[PDB]
Amino acid sequence: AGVMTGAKFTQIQFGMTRQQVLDIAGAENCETGGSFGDSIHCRGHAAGDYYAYATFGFTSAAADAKVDSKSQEKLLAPSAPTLTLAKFNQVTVGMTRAQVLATVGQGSCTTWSEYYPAYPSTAGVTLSLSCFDVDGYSSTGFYRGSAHLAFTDGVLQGKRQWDLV
């Protein structure tokens, strides 16, 4: 049994079919159509306003399309959050992913969104990261110190933070 989890999120890979996603996530946790179009949206445990969740996008609406998009909130926990507002201030538009991670801490971030519009090429890859300070992350409630870092082709395009100290 089991709800959608961080582990299941990790196991699902770009290139996978719709049936693979369902097999790994657990079909009873997932839905498609409606608000989600041809994507597959799978629910984790109840959390704050909604639930922890993942959303998997596909190359087309075809039954045989492949995963080109992975998104989640509150499934993945940062492994060592060391972000602070000061470090957030040092982050600048135009930095590479490598330089951003060196500034905010190599374990402060989780992947909120990762999309390949030209799958399987990485051309135009958009990456969105959620980053946290010491006790900022919450998988069942409301963040208490977080930032949103957005990249395109591995280069920082934007940053935003809430409640960081």
Next chain:
Amino acid sequence: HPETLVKVKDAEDQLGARVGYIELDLNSGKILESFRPEERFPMMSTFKVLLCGAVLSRIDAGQEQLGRRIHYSQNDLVEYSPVTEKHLTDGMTVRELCSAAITMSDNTAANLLLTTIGGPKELTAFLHNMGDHVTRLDRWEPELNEAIPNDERDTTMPVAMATTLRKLLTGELLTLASRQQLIDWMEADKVAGPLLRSALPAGWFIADKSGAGERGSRGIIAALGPDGKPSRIVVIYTTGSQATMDERNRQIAEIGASLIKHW
């Protein structure tokens, strides 16, 4: 049939915090029973129904189009945005935004809708002009959920909210088309299953909207009734408790169980 009100008491004993509650007849507007009907409690996501009532009012008056498409960016995305994060590339129409705000409690959709009407000040102005001089929205998502003790920002009173919701759903404030759309959005709520819906007997109608915040805040507004027809409005809020999420859900569900058994 008086025993919902004792359960409320219990709920304060188990939760160890304030609980506000009112039950109002949908058709007459008469109050049937209440407990702390006039203390302030954080609205949390409960405000999103009021937001969309403001948007439908603008639609009714030719100020807005439900089919209008809104384009936004990554910079707009906030905590708890399952639908808006999915449509980042294509955008979303006003109608899709209210759907996501009300059925899915999408925080980014609520912010986008707030900006269409002029922000929190203008929602409060809308509420003021329809006779609600208590309810007030001051902040955007996600700050509005903080529930700071004694902070009156982003609060309402059970009695004020019940009356406002009745006016939106039964008055001539909105057209019959807009009332059907607003009620149907609430009826399709996908995120309040552990609350009143969990005590609802087969055949009963319910249209609702729940909320959750910091400091143990949790609440719900609803129009419900037997025979698949709504006949009463129910508003319940609580804030300040230390109990778990599931403990807070249980108490609200049990109050609902009691008002249903004593209908």
